[PDB]
Amino acid sequence: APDTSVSNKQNFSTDVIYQIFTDRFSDGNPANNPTGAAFDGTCTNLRLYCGGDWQGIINKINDGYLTGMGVTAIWISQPVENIYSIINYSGVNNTAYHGYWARDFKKTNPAYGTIADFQNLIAAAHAKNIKVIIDFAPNHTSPASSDQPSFAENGRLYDNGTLLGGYTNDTQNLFHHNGGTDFSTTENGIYKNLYDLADLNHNNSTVDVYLKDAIKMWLDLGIDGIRMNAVKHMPFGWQKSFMAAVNNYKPVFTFGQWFLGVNEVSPENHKFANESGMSLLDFRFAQKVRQVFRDNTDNMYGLKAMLEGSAADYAQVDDQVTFIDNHDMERFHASNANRRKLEQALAFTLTSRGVPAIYYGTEQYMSGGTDPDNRARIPSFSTSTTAYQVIQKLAPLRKCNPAIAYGSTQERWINNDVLIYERKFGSNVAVVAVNRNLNAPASISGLVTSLPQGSYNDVLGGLLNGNTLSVGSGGAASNFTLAAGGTAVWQYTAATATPTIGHVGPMMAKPGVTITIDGRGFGSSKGTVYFGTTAVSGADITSWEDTQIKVKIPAVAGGNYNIKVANAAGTASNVYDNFEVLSGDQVSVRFVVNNATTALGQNVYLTGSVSELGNWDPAKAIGPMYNQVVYQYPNWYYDVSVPAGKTIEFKFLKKQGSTVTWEGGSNHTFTAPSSGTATINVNWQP
Ligand SMILES: OC[C@H]1O[C@@H]2O[C@H]3[C@H](O)[C@@H](O)[C@@H](O[C@H]4[C@H](O)[C@@H](O)[C@@H](O[C@H]5[C@H](O)[C@@H](O)[C@@H](O[C@H]6[C@H](O)[C@@H](O)[C@@H](O[C@H]7[C@H](O)[C@@H](O)[C@@H](O[C@H]1[C@H](O)[C@H]2O)O[C@@H]7CO)O[C@@H]6CO)O[C@@H]5CO)O[C@@H]4CO)O[C@@H]3CO
Ligand SMILES: OC[C@H]1O[C@@H]2O[C@H]3[C@H](O)[C@@H](O)[C@@H](O[C@H]4[C@H](O)[C@@H](O)[C@@H](O[C@H]5[C@H](O)[C@@H](O)[C@@H](O[C@H]6[C@H](O)[C@@H](O)[C@@H](O[C@H]7[C@H](O)[C@@H](O)[C@@H](O[C@H]1[C@H](O)[C@H]2O)O[C@@H]7CO)O[C@@H]6CO)O[C@@H]5CO)O[C@@H]4CO)O[C@@H]3CO
Ligand SMILES: OC[C@H]1O[C@H](O[C@H]2[C@H](O)[C@@H](O)[C@@H](O[C@H]3[C@H](O)[C@@H](O)[C@@H](O[C@H]4[C@H](O)[C@@H](O)[C@@H](O)O[C@@H]4CO)O[C@@H]3CO)O[C@@H]2CO)[C@H](O)[C@@H](O)[C@@H]1O
Ligand SMILES: OC[C@H]1O[C@H](O[C@H]2[C@H](O)[C@@H](O)[C@@H](O)O[C@@H]2CO)[C@H](O)[C@@H](O)[C@@H]1O
Ligand SMILES: [Ca+2]
Ligand SMILES: [Ca+2]
């Protein structure tokens, strides 16, 4: 199967995701509708259930709406069972129509459907080449009150019907009871309840094994990816350990939700996407596109710097899931705004690196403010809109032109309003030109590209006023006028000669696990695959074809390697770096060091004998650790994914910049649990 196949659960860069708010899409089965106070078929009250379901989606998948648009993956509301409580948030009735208030992750939401329905959804989907991605919110359960258990369902957790426990009288400590977060610090928003939602406690063995068994259920049902909810609000080490279970069992494209403010650039965010096992939603990309194409708060130079920084700050920028809006932002298009602005922003996204994600309704010029106004019923299934035609024209390129799916980004012409960028991958080129100036044309002169000399038709065929391109030798483009608001796409595809790796996934797992290397020029015959200097050939290479390779990770020590390949003839490919070979199965262990005083600005870190602990390299040390919520300074703590049942030796450091101060005396030793979690307490040794 090629890289573009619907079966490729590891690669979503050749795809265009379509995010669906289940309740607000299409109610293909009124029988499952909630009733009375919780329901509103009129969908006039955006906080009540409107009735949308899996059958609605199947119906739309089957009647051509999605496939007509070229959409090739869908991201649906969390399928797990939510509470049934109708909560009055001060004179306003609220339902769990958004699938974020969980109660049982081992069952479905009757409103959406049953397992049978879900299975049918997956079937219908795969049959039309649309991958299926499900929201997943392992952070909390539902709204709860510790004293007032009569409130809602008390954030009660059920394991396939059996009560695990609830928020009040939480003796097992299945939940955290540290109050709510003010988002003041990263540890604050992790060990405190997001709003009033019962915060699950991952250090609890039950919680950890349960959320781990739960997602195996869904991987078993057939999902192609997972959209992790509120990743900045769950311990990171635990999350790596979650991704380890997933990847070491059944690996699937996973991206998390780490909200980034306007103009916000987080290294914490970058690091998470770089060493956690999952990519993330490109808020940086989204906010800047908005700033430039919608709010008019930054120009093309800002979008360009964004593209360049992001491309360097992200180990796998091609795994960041882009967008122009979503359920927590006002919808990109204002009733009063020039529709052409949403149009070019869409084209911009669809032709940019990463994995595009269109919020349901965008293509139908939907507008509205934040929650819940941005969550309305799709007022129309019209394939007769510019946005539609736009997505339909550009979405398919991510499959037929690798330059757009795996390419590099390079600016080739620019000013305050105009931006002409080139996407390149092998003998594949895509040049996109966008002029955000709604009232003025641009005189494009001296534009040079990588396009062979010839004539290139606007792929949008004039739709957004783009034009034909003329490229002489040098890849020099003839002078042209770039219409006010114009957007034109020019492209070229050809067979790649040398082996080129455009993608690899998963990017973190133990030896033996199978991995997918996608690109062009591999050739049909098995060749060689390298994890650093180690060669792997023949058998362990399960399948090999021109655009896709499937091979198991060799038994190399736990470390970070560079994946490379070479066709049968010995020709090597480029290096796809950042691969983490785990030391084996992962378990989340908490590390507490006591009386480790510091100076303001200096923080404690953990280092140890396995690569998961940085192999004694303080540069790769873990942290800094926390001393606010769970334990207080001078006591620091931290949850880390470590090799299961391994006997590890460790010590604590104190860094201030690259400057490090080793804990005194001897190394500590402990043995990781085989399953569940553990807690290692120790005093800092001077
Ligand atoms: O809101 C106050 C504080 O906010 C911001 O601080 C950041 C900081 O930038 C981050 O690095 C991190 O802080 C780390 C520290 O780096 C780390 O050293 C440790 O802090 C402990 C100290 O080591 C320990 O001595 C003691 O801190 C003292 C501190 O030495 C005193 O000087 C005094 O601190 C005050 C600062 O001097 C003052 O500037 C201000 O600090 C800002 C800071 O400028 C800003 O960047 O307020 C504090 C307190 O009023 O008193 C404290 C306590 O006696 O204890 C701390 C830990 O309690 O650990 C933290 C991580 O927890 O995060 C903070 C943001 O929270
Ligand atoms: O180099 C191979 C070495 O690799 C691994 O060592 C780890 C070690 O286990 C970690 O703790 C950490 O080391 C930190 C120390 O924790 C920290 O205290 C400080 O170390 C200083 C020592 O405290 C100090 O005594 C002196 O170290 C001496 C040491 O006492 C001598 O015994 C000698 O060391 C040899 C070992 O005996 C030998 O077994 C082997 O060590 C392995 C080790 O088993 C493995 O876990 O080789 C060394 C000789 O190369 O010589 C040193 C030199 O005086 O000085 C150090 C530093 O001033 O800092 C270290 C970090 O450097 O990390 C190491 C690996 O980096
Ligand atoms: O309590 C019930 C509410 O739960 C539901 O909200 C969801 C969101 O729809 C999710 O997309 C997600 O989003 C969170 C996000 O995880 C969190 O970081 C936060 O983002 C902050 C950011 O951290 C902060 O620093 C600042 O910049 O403001 C951002 C706000 O955009 O908030 C997001 C959503 O509020 O998780 C929550 C909870 O699971 C449901 O949709 C709501 O209707 C409901 O009230
Ligand atoms: O000819 C190469 C040149 O092309 C682009 O420069 C544009 C520039 O963006 C415009 O603002 C204007 O000045 O015309 C120039 C071309 O004549 C690239 O930006 C630049 O890197 C490149 O060298
Ligand atoms: Ca229904
Ligand atoms: Ca949390």
Swiss-Prot record:
Binding site for Ca(2+) 1: D27, N29, N32, N33, G51, D53
Keywords: Calcium, Disulfide bond, Glycosyltransferase, Metal-binding, Secreted, Signal, Transferase
An example Gene Ontology CC term for this record: extracellular region
Ranges where the record places region D: 496-582
Catalytic residues of the enzyme: N229, Q257
Cofactor(s) required for function per UniProt: Ca(2+)
This protein's record includes keyword ATP-binding: no
Source superkingdom: Bacteria
Positions contributing to Ca(2+) 3 binding: A315, D577
The protein's Enzyme Commission number: 2.4.1.19
Region of interest called A2, as start-end residue ranges on this chain: 203-406
Gene Ontology biological process terms in this record: carbohydrate metabolic process
Binding site for substrate: 100-101, 140, 145-147, 193-196, 227, 232-233, 327, 371, 375
Subunit structure and binding partners: Monomer.
Swiss-Prot/TrEMBL domain comment: May consist of two protein domains: the one in the N-terminal side cleaves the alpha-1,4-glucosidic bond in starch, and the other in the C-terminal side catalyzes other activities, including the reconstitution of an alpha-1,4-glucosidic linkage for cyclizing the maltooligosaccharide produced.
Protein name: Cyclomaltodextrin glucanotransferase
Lineage: Bacteria, Bacillati, Bacillota, Bacilli, Bacillales
Gene: cgt
